Design a protein around this ligand. Sequence first.
Ligand SMILES: CCS(=O)(=O)c1ccc([C@@H](CC(=O)NC)C(=O)Nc2ccc(C(O)(C(F)(F)F)C(F)(F)F)cc2)cc1
Ligand code: NA
Lengths: 12, 252
Amino acid sequence: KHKILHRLLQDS
Amino acid sequence: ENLYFQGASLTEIEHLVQSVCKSYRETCQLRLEDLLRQRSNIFSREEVTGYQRKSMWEMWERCAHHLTEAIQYVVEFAKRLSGFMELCQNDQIVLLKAGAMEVVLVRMCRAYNADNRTVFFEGKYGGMELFRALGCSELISSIFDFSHSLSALHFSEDEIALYTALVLINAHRPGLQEKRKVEQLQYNLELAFHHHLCKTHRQSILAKLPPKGKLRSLCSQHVERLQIFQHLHPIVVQAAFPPLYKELFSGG
Ligand SMILES: CCS(=O)(=O)c1ccc([C@@H](CC(=O)NC)C(=O)Nc2ccc(C(O)(C(F)(F)F)C(F)(F)F)cc2)cc1
Ligand code: NA
């Protein structure tokens, strides 16, 4: 259940 | 939330063309000049044989890793696209899950040489025979045919920038909560792309762009072939495929 998209989106 | 979620004027559409082309230039992954220059660096018969002797699982792992790297640049392109960060997180994820691979497939035509039917992979150009160990020859052939058809359009970098922004901002993706916001953003990006084509006397490509069903079919075949590979080597996918790749193509 990998969830990387939310991390990439939230990282600024 | 964003000017492009409502009606935009001609001056605002001109500003949108510049903005999209800038977001693309900053996230294009490899420069076009760098890809063109390397066209003369082609894998030898011995090197092709070496790739064909690699195991199916090691080739699948290498291709998934390189695709994941390309997808990461598409995620960054989306983050820099006007309006995208103003959509809700549910919608950002819906659009990236459905469209990231489609954008990568479009961008890939830049790395495809129609003169000898080769693609840039791991430092040199190789034909579809380079990937024979994957055991998904129909999918590879379909990707090469698609790349060949886009290559015949002679896309400029600015045309790829505007066309890929539209591939991503598709208000028809199932699961979008703010569908009207996405429709208005898509309408403005469509005007930006068509304005640029009009200004550059390139409107003849509009009837020549592939149908949406074509990118959908390539994405469906990719997921189907991955499911077949996963049934054969489940622990390879679980232990050695990138987590982002699995989130997009194998439900986690
Ligand atoms: C897409 C953005 S761009 O044009 O800047 C750009 C093109 C090609 C590469 C190479 C880099 C590389 O090789 N780094 C080690 C690249 O990623 N090439 C590749 C990867 C994957 C495939 C396939 O899975 C499929 F299916 F996408 F074509 C394949 F053929 F192996 F099955 C093809 C080419 C990088 C960047
Ligand atoms: Na090309």
